[PDB]
Structure formats: C-alpha cells, structure tokens
Amino acid sequence: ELDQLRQEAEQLKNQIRDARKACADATLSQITNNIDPVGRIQMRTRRTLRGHLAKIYAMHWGTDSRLLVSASQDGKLIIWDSYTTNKVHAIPLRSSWVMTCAYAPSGNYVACGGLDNICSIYNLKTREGNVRVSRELAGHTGYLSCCRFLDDNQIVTSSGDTTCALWDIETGQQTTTFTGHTGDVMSLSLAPDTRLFVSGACDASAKLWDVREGMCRQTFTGHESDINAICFFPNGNAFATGSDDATCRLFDLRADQELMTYSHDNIICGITSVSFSKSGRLLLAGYDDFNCNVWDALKADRAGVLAGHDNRVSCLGVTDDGMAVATGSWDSFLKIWN
Amino acid sequence: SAEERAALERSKAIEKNLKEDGISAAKDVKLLLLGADNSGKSTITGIVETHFTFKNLHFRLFDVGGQRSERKKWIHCFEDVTAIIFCVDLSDHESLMLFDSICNNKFFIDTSIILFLNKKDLFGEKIKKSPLTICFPEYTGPNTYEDAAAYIQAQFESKNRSPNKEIYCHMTCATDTNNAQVIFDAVTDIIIANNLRGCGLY
C-alpha cells in the first residue's frame, strides 16, 4: 500500500520535472544578452556604527529608511540613527543568544529571537519612556531563525524545527502554522504586498507559502546544500536564494523554476544574505569570505566587490529607499555602504 | 541644534553604559558543556545556562543538549568559548563519534577540550563483572580498572588531529568537590596558552 503512494509521488515529481522543462523555451541570459552591463558599480563606506561588544547576527531597516536595529550576541539590541550614528535605544535582551531581529513597518515594535526558542516583541513607544517586552511568543520546538512583521499585530516566524508560523502579538497564540520542510527553516522573506512569503530550509529546498490558506503553494530546489538566506525580488514575481554551496539562484514564481546561477570559481564560502536593490538590477549577496559581491541580477555576472570586514558578514539589509546598504559582521562593525 | 545636541548626549550616555556592561561581562569565563544523555553532566527547554564562582572567576556553563537541531547551524554561536567540557558515562562509551565530530569541527580546531570521565567507581565495579571487550571488542589487554581506564582515555584523546589544541582528560567519582579546582587550573593553563599566543610567542 505504502509503495503505491511512493510510486505515485515519484510519478508526480517526474511530471513536475517534465512540465518545468517544457516551459524552458529560453534562459535569462539568452534574452538579456541584448542588454548593456551596469559596469563597475563601486561603493564606499559612508559610516560605521561602532558599539557592539561581540558578533553581530542580524540587522533590519525601519520603513522610514533611517532607523536601523542591530542584534548581537553581546545581549543588546541597539537602534541606530543611520544619518547621525547616534544610538537611540540600547534594549537589554533576556538572553544573549540572539539570532534574528525585525523592525516593524510602523516603527512601533522591534522583534527579537534566537536559541531561546522564544520571539520577544519589544514595544518602543511606551508611555513610561522605557522600552519593554510586550509579548514573549513561545511554542516552537527549536530556535527561531528569522522573523518579520506583516503589521503591528501579526508576526511570521521561522524556526529550526522545520516549521514556519504566523502569530498574533495581541494574544500570543498562533493563527496559522506552516509545515512541510524536512530540514531546519533557516530563513524567511515576506513578499512586498505581504500576501505570501517564502522560506529557505536546510534541506536545500525553498517553498512558497500562502498566509491566508495556511498551506504551501510552490516548491523550489536546485542548490546542493542548505539555503542560508532568501529575499524577494522587488517586483514580487521572483526571489533570490543563497546557499552554503557558494552560489545564489534566482527563482521565478510564475515560471516555477530557477532562471540564473550567480557563481564564480574563486568562491567556496557560503552565502549569508541575498538582498536586492530597489530597481532589482543588483543582487548584493554577502559571503563568509568577508566580502559582499554585487551581482548584476539580469546579466548574471559580477558588478563589483564591497569589502572591509575582518570577519564574516551576517546581514546585507538594503534601505527601502535604495539609498544605502548596511552590512553587519562578526567583528561588530555595522558599516553603512553607499 | 538644541534638540539634536540632547540626542547626542543620550547617545554618549548609552554608549558609556554599553562600555560599562562590557567591562562587567569581561570578567566571566564561558565554557560549552557537552555529553551523551544522562552521561555524567548532571553530577558535576532551550539552552540551559548555569554559572558559578571560584577564585573570583565567574564561570558560565552552557548545557546546549536541548537543541533538537543540527549542530552545524547553531554551534557557530559558541566559536568564542574558552573551553569545551566534554563528559563521558564511563559506566556504560558510545560518545566517541560525537567527540570526533566536535573536536574537528571547523570552528573548534583552536579551542581545547576538557574531558571528564565520570562514574569511574561504577566502571571499576563493572570490570569485576564484565570485560572491557564488551564495549570495545578491539581491546587487547588484561581486565583491570587501571589498564581499561588508560585505554579508553587514550582512545578519546586519539580522536584529535589538529596540534593547535589540547585535551585535558580527567577522572571523577561524582562524590568530590575537586571538580571546581580541576576546571579552574585547566582554564588557567588555557588562558596562559591563549595569552602566549596573543604575544606572538606560543
């Protein structure tokens, strides 16, 4: 009985392969060969937000494109005024082992989580002037790896226990739970319209989730090893994924298959962030080799190299205005590049 | 601007507070703690932090065994630990694969391991009833406490390959206070080694 189900699943996967291959009437390069390159896109260090005591593990940009929140295993989530380097808040964490953070679109809330298996929703605009935990969201069986806000109330989270979940910070309960990965769900990225999101798992597969259905919609694959970071293309019809296999791939949602593979024989180090620029021409991948390598997303070749860290980069958040790209790193210096 | 200047004052107050907290934290010594299930750790839901003080040091021990996840994805957090305390239930000896994995992990080739063989008395009494061949068929020697203990001790240390680190094996009967002194002096030797490395001299 079980063997019949396994055979039918194999037949279904074969049909997936056949249908995906039939639609591949061209490659991205075969069309983009008529397009001129961006040339040498050199970028330089404008500022350097010093002040973390240890390795920085996450950074996120406020929707106003000025405040940036950084989280480090020193146990402090500090909010930076990026135009003046002034530190605005120094939030003490209940545990030092933070691995992700998020800045709410309204700017009212700052999320934080890590090996605690608990996601803390800090409230910034408290009447008493201090910043205090609003909720301590709990229920994952493993470390919360990445979290993002859809609005001030409901936060989506991704955890090492092969699950992504959608919370309500108004009640602390899960409104919906997403399951289906085999490995740890290392990273997550919400689409620009927040109607749906993608997550990359340590089983080298990336999935498309629908927050209102509560179920998967499409599944993507193609890296040899775990996906470390993932981010939507700003048009909402594609997303880039960066694996530990020292390559970044661009997956089209409507074409249901990988379109391009950014890699270079000099590279052996794993990816750690795959954020785009606002026009989508530039994919500012960040590498464990201490460098951020800007790939021209359509010509599929290197546009430039950004360097300066004495240790691996942990984030490559691009401002919502496209004005600057921040790069936190394990040497505690969150440089601002523009 | 008479508004921005007060924000600048706020930034230099909280920067000072960050520096003071860092100075306070610098006195602690962080040790990772590992071992098999029920294997001696308890005698000596997420991360289980525990801490103590000895000779004005403030040792922090992390029992990370609660993480039901691949080591590879979170072990990089502990890249900065001073030492790894590894425990073995000698009365059992299946942990050698875990030791092999953790000793040559990409992040720990420079971090020395402290290795407590634990429940040694139960092992000695078991030797009077079962040969060491039962947990190690390859064993070639007499059935006695001292030789079997030395054998498994060398067997654990034989897993290291990188010369950049040392294994400070030790034995405990889980009925003595000597554990704190042993860890303190081993950590003192470890810190001296790290200091000599920093001087470009080690």
């Epitope: 005024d81 | 921005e4 007060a6």
Partner: single-chain antibody, 232 residues
C-alpha cells in the same frame, strides 16, 4: 499612569528664599529631562530652567540666571528648584515639565499640576491675535510668528503648540509644527514654514476651549507666545 506632582508653594517675603520640589512616579525618570515653566497670575507662560538626563547640562532664563538653581535626585525620582532673593515679579504658578530627546521623540509631552508661589538676542515669539470668539462645528485658526526662521538646516522646524484649558495645566497638541501629539484627537493640524506658523482646528468641539501657546525649541532659552484665547 504617569503622574507628576510638585510641592513647596505658599507666601514668601520678598528677598527671601524657598525650595520647590517635583516628584515623579510611573515612568523612567532617570532617562527624562526636566524643565520648570511658570505662569504669571493673569499672563502667558514664561520659561525658568532646564536639567538634562543624568544632570549633564543645565540652562536658565536670563531673568533668573544665578537667582535660582535646579538640581535633581534621580534615585528619589525628585527634581528640585532652589530659589533665592525672590523679587515681586517672581510670583507665579510653577509647572514641572518632562521631556525626552531622540529621533522621533516628543518633548514636553506631560505637565505637572503646578504650585502657586507668591510674594508679598533670544528668539522672540509673537501671536497676532489675543482672543478669537468661536462656536462648535465651525473650524478655527490660530497663527504665530517668529523673529528667526525655526526651520533648521537638518529639516526639522522646532515650533511647538500647547493647549491650556481653564483651570488646568497645559497639554501638548502639535510638536515640530507638523506632528500630532500622542493621544490628542485628530481634529488639530499644524502648518506653516520659515517664520510663520498656523494651527488649524477642524470641526471644533467645546472640549477645545482655552488658550493656545506657540513655542520654539530652536535655542535656549525657550520662549512662549502671548497666547490666543479660543473663547466659546
């Protein structure tokens, strides 16, 4: 709830001395600044003194510098104003005003109840109108002007608007001349640029009767306008 109460008023002989204290509860007093603002018995507000968080910096009004001294006991959540050589002009009700400064912060957001104490080159703020008779349902307008342009080069314009209801302490309504204060209805709206500012009230209700003071924060000492009475 956040609460501020001050004490130490009464009648003092001219030339004497007195200590006024401000007691804070329900908020992180150590991280807030504190100001003193005083009101003559039938006149608009006037500024007195400042003290920053952690006692780092202090400022005084020109009419007061050296006559008063301001200090705070942060662990006791208490601010002190030590006062000497009281002149006939020093009779006023004194309000304790909190403030906190960072990007996106709202200074002067909460005011104490005030203590009646009586005795036996700066930017000048001016309002073109003294009284405006008005009725509910209609819109209302109040306007204020500055001798120097408040729009600093960094893009902030530091005009502030306070509403004082009869028999009560002032409350913040509009800060930095465009932003709406926390907890005030949406009926109010600031506007203007450079040296002229306007506060517009849409669909007025009787709850908004009182005196509206414009204020600048571009430089110390801070200065209040003479106040426009929106009278029912």
């Amino acid at each position: 709830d956040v609460q501020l109460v001050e004490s130490g008023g009464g009648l003092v002989q001219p030339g004497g001395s007195r200590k006024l204290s401000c007691s804070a509860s329900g908020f992180a007093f150590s991280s807030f600044g504190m100001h003193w603002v005083r009101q003559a018995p039938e006149k608009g507000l006037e500024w007195v003194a400042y003290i920053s968080s952690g006692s780092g910096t202090i400022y005084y009004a020109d009419t007061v510098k050296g006559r008063f001294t301001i200090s705070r006991d942060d662990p006791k959540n208490t601010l002190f104003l030590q006062m000497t050589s009281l002149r006939s002009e020093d009779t006023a009700m004194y309000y304790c005003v909190r403030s906190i400064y960072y990007y996106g912060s709202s200074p002067f957001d909460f005011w104490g109840q005030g203590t009646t104490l009586t005795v036996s080159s700066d930017i000048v703020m001016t309002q073109a109108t003294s009284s405006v008779p008005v009725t509910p349902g209609e819109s209302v307008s109040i306007s204020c002007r500055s001798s120097k342009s408040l729009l600093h080069s960094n893009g902030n314009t530091y005009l502030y608007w306070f509403l004082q209801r009869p028999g009560q302490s002032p409350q913040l309504l509009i800060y930095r001349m465009s932003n709406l204060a926390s907890g005030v209805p949406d009926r109010f709206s600031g506007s203007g640029s450079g040296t002229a500012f306007t506060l517009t009230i849409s669909r007025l209700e009787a709850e908004d009767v009182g005196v509206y003071y414009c204020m600048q924060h571009l430089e110390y000492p801070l200065t209040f306008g003479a106040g426009t009475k929106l009278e029912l």
